[PDB]
Design a protein around this ligand. Structure first.
Ligand SMILES: [Hg+2]
Ligand SMILES: [Hg+2]
Ligand SMILES: [Hg+2]
Ligand SMILES: [Hg+2]
Ligand SMILES: [Hg+2]
Ligand SMILES: [Hg+2]
Ligand SMILES: [Hg+2]
Ligand SMILES: [Hg+2]
Ligand SMILES: [Hg+2]
Ligand SMILES: [Hg+2]
Ligand SMILES: [Hg+2]
Ligand SMILES: [Hg+2]
Ligand SMILES: [Hg+2]
Ligand SMILES: [Mn+2]
Ligand SMILES: [Mn+2]
Ligand SMILES: [Mn+2]
Ligand SMILES: [Mn+2]
Lengths: 341, 340
């Protein structure tokens, strides 16, 4: 029931962000929510090319690293690579079929495109630091600890996509498919979208930021500086991406965009809270493992657990959730040097 | 049965372009087909921002045009806006879910993104040459002649998306859905994808080029030069887009990718031919509306018809199809100045 060009003339300023009439004309002279047009403009202004960053000294730095620090560095880079592989395709496959205002549709396609640049930059780094990149890329898919740390991200997107297909094909109701009852509920689909957007917010606003702490701890020691320059550009984009999901989530919960969505958000406040705490716990578990063969220099599992708690509290407060952790000031203020946002 | 991160460690150099295992890791150190990596690199090198193009003199030029020339200019621009609105979202909703090699997945997302830039450029032109952009944008949706010229584009993509959802949800076989028998055939889905790609090839290689000729006819008169700079940048991107679809199609026909696709391309060759003939006739039919209020020196229905036949023959030959039209030299050689 989805269409690439809805033939009904509609007022795009009055449609909800999601589940309304599919967007027909792509226009940018007006918007329901100007934050999305501002984000498109900023992201276009930040366009960068990975190939332009010099990573020629990173190979020697990496080879000089102690084995446990090589492990920390490459494990962290593999996780960044996994997250951006998912983020280049997923916002497009999962959200585009559900968006009903043009500025949000183009923001999603712009956001997803920017993630493909991030994926291209990891290839540029990897190719310049190991003789055979396949060694690194082939360990991402079945790497035990990576799977563990990112567990559940692909499932939230996959479940939302499956439910969306059933809704577009069959519509609301109680259906049968090959002898089994299949219930399609718009309310349940709205809940799946909300929890998925909350997960994306945790992904870009907490999972990536923990990864930036690792990358920039090397930059502080003047090591892996090509990687550092790339991660700096990636973090500048991720700040926009987190800004977009925070606004989506706050507009949905306030009730100003879709009243039903506001009721749904309040109804799963406890679920949302526990999923954020679970994301935090997975990052802690990763840090504990990664810093087992030996803590790095300027970073260790305890400093990293503290940073995870610090940033989780900030991000949860930004979308109206209670704080799960003791409040403290930033345990690694030096990181602000690198987060030019 | 679609997944955003397939858990099987697979050799991406051995998957088919479409219908294999969904791509898991996005890597660019190797490619089954380097042409798509080259296309990503070239499109990225062409990155441009519409708003930076100076269109301040176009408002003066546009208001100075006789009424019928305003009609020709704006009718063409509304069609370009329709096509790019569809092309910004459609490759991502219709093709992305079926791609199984990383270089083609990223090419498709890069290509779709580049179309959103084209749409943004039309907003930049429109808001700067007319007082109420809404009248222009709303007319795109409701305009009977515009929709007539584009008929079949959205429908093809929509049918492909529907069939794809049934395949991902139910898998191959004959099913019972709410008491109706629903057949999901992967071979039929491959045919739908294949013909959708041929239709996209016609869209970027013919329909957009006829629109470029209309735009540039004003630039030849030394008017609407801001629009001309933008259309020049857009045409440079479209050349890459049609290169992409010609290569997808010709690789599928070669038998070097999925062998079933090579069988399909041969078996469905009359349908390929027919959809090009139909698109050409739609572009010709549009002339009656375009020139309803009068034509222009060097731009009228006859000239448009000749150009449609000329470019259609060129594009059909490029993907191995017989030529429907009498061969002719280019009726508007002045367009080469603008296309580079
Ligand atoms: Hg999501
Ligand atoms: Hg999600
Ligand atoms: Hg880390
Ligand atoms: Hg580190
Ligand atoms: Hg929730
Ligand atoms: Hg919530
Ligand atoms: Hg949550
Ligand atoms: Hg912690
Ligand atoms: Hg297509
Ligand atoms: Hg198509
Ligand atoms: Hg023309
Ligand atoms: Hg064919
Ligand atoms: Hg003709
Ligand atoms: Mn990213
Ligand atoms: Mn991101
Ligand atoms: Mn275009
Ligand atoms: Mn195009």
């Amino acid at each position: 029931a989805y269409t690439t060009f809805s033939q009904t003339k509609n007022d795009q300023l009055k449609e909800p962000m999601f589940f309304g009439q599919p967007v027909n004309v792509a226009r940018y002279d007006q918007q329901k929510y100007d934050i999305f047009e501002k984000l498109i403009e900023k992201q276009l202004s930040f366009f960068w090319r990975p190939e332009e960053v010099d990573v020629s000294r990173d190979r020697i730095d990496y080879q000089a690293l102690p084995e446990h620090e090589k492990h920390i560095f490459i494990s962290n880079l593999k996780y960044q690579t996994l997250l951006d592989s998912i983020q280049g395709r997923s916002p497009n496959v999962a959200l585009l079929p559900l968006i009903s205002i043009p500025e949000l549709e183009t923001w999603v396609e712009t956001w997803a495109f920017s993630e493909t640049i991030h994926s291209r930059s990891y290839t540029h780094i990897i190719r310049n630091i190991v003789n055979d990149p396949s060694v690194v890329f082939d360990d991402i898919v079945t790497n035990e600890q990576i799977q563990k740390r990112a567990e559940g991200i692909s499932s939230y997107y996959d479940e939302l996509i499956e439910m969306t297909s059933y809704w577009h094909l069959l519509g609301e109701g109680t259906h049968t498919v090959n002898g089994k009852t299949v219930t399609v509920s718009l309310r349940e689909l709205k809940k799946k979208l909300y929890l998925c957007l909350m997960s994306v917010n945790a992904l870009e606003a907490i999972r990536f930021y923990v990864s930036f702490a690792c990358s920039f701890a090397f930059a502080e020691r003047e090591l892996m500086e090509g990687n550092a320059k790339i991660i700096r550009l990636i973090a500048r984009d991720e700040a926009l991406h987190l800004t977009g999901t925070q606004h989506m989530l706050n507009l949905l919960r306030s009730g100003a965009d879709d009243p039903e969505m506001a009721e749904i958000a309040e109804e799963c406040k406890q679920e949302c809270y526990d999923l954020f705490v679970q994301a935090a716990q997975q990052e802690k578990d990763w840090a504990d493992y990664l810093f087992r063969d030996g803590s790095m220099i300027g970073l260790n599992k305890d400093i990293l657990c503290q940073y995870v708690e610090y940033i989780t509290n900030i991000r949860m407060q930004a979308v109206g959730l209670d704080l799960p952790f003791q409040t403290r000031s930033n345990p690694i203020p030096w990181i602000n040097t690198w987060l030019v946002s």
